Design a protein around this ligand. Structure first.
Ligand code: SF4
Ligand code: SF4
Ligand code: SF4
Ligand code: SF4
Ligand code: FES
Ligand SMILES: [Zn+2]
Lengths: 230, 48, 95, 208, 126, 176, 114
């Protein structure tokens, strides 16, 4: 009755047809690591972290936006899956500056967690390390676009939820500045939400900026006020 | 240190004041922080 | 290079000084309120802003593995100076 | 793999596997689990009735000597109906092997006082009675070791907090040392360090 | 030896030793810890944490600190199920509040419908 | 492989038993012990004349808790809280604020010298090597207030000397 | 649902053991006030003994009553010997107030405790 079997590590499970491989792995409990996927936005494929070795094929394919054919067998813990993840993680950490002391996401990074739990232990790339000059987006959001990994998630969030259309990719090669061209103060509603969209420390809060670091705090239940929805 | 005395740093004291406990001149601790919660000021302007 | 409070004592580099209705002033009685009289804000302005003849430059801070790590900063602001967050000192560019 | 990783010896793995299978098949009355770790030290998981017969069988019988007794700790685990774990540790003088006898127990029903068969468990039973509350049935002397006398609360539990409920201070009014409810000098920040993203895929338990 | 045993509730608050005010005044909260939204990872989910309500934390006026008279303020108990959570909280005595678990609802996302023709779903940038 | 003590028997030769009985009656090896102790009497004593001859030390002693600063520059710290995270006694207490310069800074940086167990984790955990276990170990504090250091006590402790700490770090920046 | 009891079958032996323990504590007090050289009359000590017995007077599980019998018997042993010094026996009392009342009004002027 409209269910397709996937063999996640040999374990069979039923999946609604048309949905992604990644939702099947999250159904059985697996987390394939991801940087450009999010469970509220459209599914672009620009981060290359979601890869998986599907059997009987010489080519590793993505799992952020893969449709599910009948009767798969998914290997999330094979050899070249780990080699692809270590390779892509070594690619990401080249043009990314040493700011982990002063970056505002010491406890709440994503490069740090996934670089521990999937990445290499030694680096390379002795020269290089380009630098992008920052902008001044607004007095609400502090912005250093050097840490921007060009993951195209603020763009999709803006253009598909904010509806404002004031963010864009510019350029080619390494030189892809994600930002706003005309030096306009990007001011709209929900612009405070963009500092949790950005998975790296590139779009942080302006008044908060250098007052804590997220392992010292303790987290507490509460309810929204001054809005009728809560 | 008649072989290499100095360092090229312009902040080192010219006194080297030694262990100064049991004096009128020693250290006390305090809060190196500004105002916490900024209590409200009543208006001096009256009514009635 | 310090200020002095209207109460008559030395303020810190942070404006943390007391009011007249406190008592930590009276636990400061008899023993000296220490303050490092060589601040850090004014020592930046006495430094020469270096004018490096390239586009995107490097910073270490006086010594390999003795200081802060490599930060490569950009100088594309045509009238503003690129500021190292570690060093605290500025740069320019001259083609 | 060949540098920087401690290898394992599958000879000892097969030997301990066969021995644990032997012990489990010859004492069916009280055995539930015989698990072998990767580093080959045996664990035998036991119902809290046959403590005295399993220890008398494992002191003797000449297929396994295990004259040497070590520690006993009952590490406190919530989300179990029977909470605490008595961990006997047994060492053979002739054989160079280590078996961890884990019998389970609850908060109130006693295990059967291993001091009668192993004389080294006397202060162990007294100490774990003071620190936990695991009673031992027909034991000679049950007192408080490693606590204050007037103190109570069984402090190595998980319900007992890190800072105790008391705080001593001398005072000159009553000319002695008295206890007040606790007043910290700093908060003891218990940080959040549980990071996500599943560092061990081989230990993913099956969910609901 | 299979004796008289009755099958009833437990009253372990007399034996845990902590006094009456910290027994009956503070109220536990059994909750699943929500996802820290600046990251995106639900490994920190799948447990039932029991915590207590916070209380006063003043300023120690000699160093600018946060002292408190609260021994029970810094506990957390990680549990595997809500059932044993409620069983433990009613075993040990203190009053409690239990919330329920919230999951990501399964959506149906597709790149091909993100490049549609006559629908209003269109990425307009990629 | 083993080598165990005390396996012999007292001899039955008359010479050996009368030598042992001579040791018994004649206090002999007691006098030999006196001779050994007088042989250590006539040595020269290895005492150091303390306030004039201070004791030997290491290049990497863990002492004074003094901060450092940049060459002809500002404060070296960042308030990045790595030392507070690694501090096993949890004696480090940091409150940060940024200043008008834009770069991130502090407000409060307290070390509980009462609680500090003097490990070296904050020396080895600072990514810019701002906090350094100082050279000298002479604290000797009358009150209990004075063993609670502020940022200004640490900076005056690091500006009464850095050339010592600079000499130590320049000596052993290669091991750590 | 089989539980091995500690000492008693029903509440009868529990009541018998706890009144035996109370008899022992009643005949044990003047020896303590003569030995440790306390500062409190016999009446006040016996009144706080019967207060501590009356505090837990509503527990009906016989295992718990047996375990409190074991607790009280351990403390009776360690007070009938000369182990527990003057500090612990004074620590049973509460003369170091803590006068924190149980009103609403005085709990309101010293707040944050509803
Ligand atoms: S986002 Fe920040 S914490 Fe993460 S790797 Fe980049 S600089 Fe480091
Ligand atoms: S600013 Fe952040 S969200 Fe936007 S593309 Fe860059 S890394 Fe991604
Ligand atoms: S680790 Fe170093 S830079 Fe970071 S807060 Fe501590 S002293 Fe400052
Ligand atoms: S030496 Fe140890 S206890 Fe002392 S401040 Fe450093 S990390 Fe903390
Ligand atoms: S999730 Fe980024 S590539 Fe599939
Ligand atoms: Zn720099």
């Amino acid at each position: 009755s409209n269910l397709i079997e996937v063999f996640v590590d040999g374990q069979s499970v039923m999946v609604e047809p048309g949905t992604t491989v990644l939702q099947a792995c999250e159904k059985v409990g697996m987390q394939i690591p991801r940087f450009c996927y999010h469970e509220r936005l459209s599914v672009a494929g620009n981060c290359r972290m979601c890869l998986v070795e599907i059997e009987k094929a010489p080519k590793v394919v993505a799992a952020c936006a893969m449709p599910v054919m009948k009767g798969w067998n998914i290997l999330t813990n094979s050899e070249k899956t780990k080699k692809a993840r270590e390779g892509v993680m070594e690619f990401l950490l080249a043009n990314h500056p040493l700011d982990c002391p002063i970056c505002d996401q010491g406890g709440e990074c994503d490069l740090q967690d996934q670089s521990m739990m999937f990445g290499s232990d030694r680096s390379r790339f002795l020269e290089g390390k380009r630098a992008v000059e920052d902008k001044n987006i607004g007095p609400l959001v502090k912005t250093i676009m050097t840490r921007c990994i060009q993951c195209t998630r603020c763009i999709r969030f803006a253009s598909e939820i904010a509806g404002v259309d004031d963010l864009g990719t510019t350029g080619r090669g390494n030189d892809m500045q994600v930002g706003t061209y005309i030096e306009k103060m990007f001011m709209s509603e929900l612009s405070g939400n963009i500092i949790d969209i950005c998975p790296v420390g590139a779009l942080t809060s302006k008044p908060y900026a250098f007052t804590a670091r997220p392992w010292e705090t303790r987290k507490t239940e509460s309810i929204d006020v001054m809005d009728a929805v809560g | 240190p008649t072989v290499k005395p100095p360092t090229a740093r312009k902040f080192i004291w010219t006194n080297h004041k030694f262990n100064l406990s049991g004096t009128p001149q020693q250290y006390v601790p305090y809060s190196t922080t500004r105002k916490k919660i900024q209590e409200w000021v009543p208006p001096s302007t009256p009514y009635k | 290079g310090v200020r002095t409070s209207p109460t008559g004592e030395k303020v810190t580099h942070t404006g943390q000084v007391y009011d007249d209705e406190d008592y930590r002033r009276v636990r400061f009685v008899g023993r000296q309120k220490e303050v490092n009289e060589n601040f850090a804000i004014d020592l930046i302005a006495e430094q020469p802003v270096s004018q490096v003849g390239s586009r995107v430059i490097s910073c270490d801070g006086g010594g390999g593995a003795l200081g802060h790590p490599r930060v490569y900063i950009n100088l594309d602001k045509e009238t503003k100076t690129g500021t190292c967050g570690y060093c605290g000192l500025q740069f320019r560019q001259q083609h | 793999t060949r540098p920087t990783v401690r290898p394992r010896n599958d000879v000892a793995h097969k030997q301990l596997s066969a021995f644990g299978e032997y012990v489990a098949e010859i004492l069916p009355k009280y055995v539930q689990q015989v698990q072998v770790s990767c580093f080959s030290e045996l664990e035998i998981c036991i119902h809290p009735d046959g403590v005295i017969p399993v220890l008398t069988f494992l002191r003797d019988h000449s297929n396994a000597q295990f004259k040497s007794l070590a520690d006993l700790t009952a590490v406190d685990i919530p989300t179990r109906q029977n909470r605490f774990e008595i961990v006997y540790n047994l060492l053979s003088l002739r054989f160079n092997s280590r078996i961890r006898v884990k019998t389970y127990t609850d908060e109130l029903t006693p295990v059967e006082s291993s001091v009668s068969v192993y004389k080294a468990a006397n202060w162990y039973e007294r100490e774990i009675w003071d620190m936990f509350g695991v009673f031992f049935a027909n034991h000679p002397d049950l007192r408080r070791i490693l606590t204050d006398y007037g103190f109570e609360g069984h402090p190595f539990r998980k319900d007992f907090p890190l800072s105790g409920y008391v705080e001593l201070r001398y005072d000159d009014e009553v000319k002695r040392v008295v206890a007040e409810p606790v007043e910290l000098a700093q908060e003891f920040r218990k940080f959040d360090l549980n990071s996500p993203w599943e560092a061990f895929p081989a230990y993913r338990q099956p969910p609901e | 030896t299979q004796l008289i045993t009755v099958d009833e509730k437990l009253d372990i608050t007399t034996l845990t030793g902590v006094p009456e005010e910290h027994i009956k005044t503070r109220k536990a909260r059994i909750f699943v810890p929500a996802r820290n939204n600046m990251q995106s990872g639900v490994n920190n989910t799948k447990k039932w944490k029991m915590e207590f309500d916070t209380r006063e934390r003043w300023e120690n006026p000699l160093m600018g600190w946060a002292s408190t008279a609260d021994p029970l303020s810094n506990l957390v108990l990680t549990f595997s199920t809500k059932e044993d959570a409620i069983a433990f909280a009613e075993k040990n005595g203190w009053s409690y509040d239990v919330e329920e678990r919230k999951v990501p609802k399964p959506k149906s996302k597709s790149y091909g419908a993100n490049f549609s023709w006559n629908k209003r779903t269109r990425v307009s940038t990629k | 492989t083993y080598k165990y003590v005390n396996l012999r028997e007292p001899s039955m030769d008359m010479k050996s038993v009368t030598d042992r009985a001579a040791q018994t009656l004649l206090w002999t090896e007691l006098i030999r012990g006196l001779g050994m102790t007088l042989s250590y009497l006539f040595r020269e004593p290895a005492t150091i004349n303390y306030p004039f001859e201070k004791g030997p030390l290491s290049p990497r002693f863990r002492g004074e808790h003094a901060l450092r600063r940049y060459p002809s520059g500002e404060e070296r710290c960042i308030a990045c809280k790595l030392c507070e995270a690694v501090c096993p006694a949890q004696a480090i207490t940091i409150e940060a604020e940024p200043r008008a310069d834009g770069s991130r800074r502090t407000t409060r940086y307290d070390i509980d010298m009462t609680k500090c167990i003097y490990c070296g984790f904050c020396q080895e955990a600072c990514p810019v090597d701002a906090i350094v276990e100082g050279p000298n170990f002479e604290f000797s504090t009358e009150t209990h207030e004075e063993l609670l250091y502020n940022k200004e006590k640490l900076l005056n402790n690091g500006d009464k000397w850095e050339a010592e700490i600079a000499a130590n770090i320049q000596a052993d920046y290669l091991y750590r | 649902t089989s539980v091995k009891p500690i000492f008693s079958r029903d509440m009868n032996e529990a009541k018998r053991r706890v009144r035996e323990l109370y008899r022992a504590w009643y005949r044990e007090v003047p020896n303590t006030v003569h030995l440790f050289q306390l500062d409190i009359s016999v009446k006040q000590g016996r009144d706080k003994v019967r207060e501590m017995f009356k505090k837990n007077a509503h527990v009906t599980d016989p295992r718990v009553v047996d375990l409190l019998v074991i607790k009280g018997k351990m403390e009776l042993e360690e007070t009938i010997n000369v182990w527990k010094q003057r500090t612990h026996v004074m620590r049973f009392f509460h003369e170091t107030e803590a006068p924190r009342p149980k009103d609403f009004l005085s709990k309101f002027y010293v707040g944050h405790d509803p």
